[PDB]
Amino acid sequence: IEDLDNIQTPESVLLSAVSGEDTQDRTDRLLLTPWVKFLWESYRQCLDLLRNNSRVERLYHDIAQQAFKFCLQYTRKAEFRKLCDNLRMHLSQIQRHHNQSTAINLNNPESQS
């Protein structure tokens, strides 16, 4: 219906045509953006609090990969946090080890792979 809509500019957008751009972005924000700010949060969610160090967890690096593959389908600013979360939880990793935390060493899976 946006292909059929009044693209032949009315004055209501001729005022708004000094800051923003296409109406496809001005509508999809309203109905699609509420769900991607939920998806991003849900990926930070399961990575942030549930999987720190956690010896028992390959699924961490699964979610991480599947959320990196999510980035180049949709919005991009949820990736700067992605890289910096992976790093900050690596700085959480390599210091103390007082749990069932990852022995970052010769153990090929938990460290290298």
* Chain CA centroid to CA 111, Å: 23
* Smallest gap from residue 77 Cβ to RNA (A): 4
H/E segment holding residue 60: helix 59-71
Residue placing its CB nearer to RNA in the complex, 6 or 99: 99
Interface ranges with RNA (CB under 7 A): 20-21, 25-26, 29, 48-49, 75-77, 80-81, 84-85, 88, 91, 99
CA atoms of 77 and 56, how far apart (whole Å): 30
CA atoms of 87 and 93, how far apart (whole Å): 9
Residue placing its CB nearer to RNA in the complex, 14 or 80: 80
Residue placing its CB nearer to RNA in the complex, 75 or 104: 75
What would you measure as the largest C-alpha separation in the chain, in angstroms? Answer: 67
* Smallest gap from residue 113 Cβ to RNA (A): 25
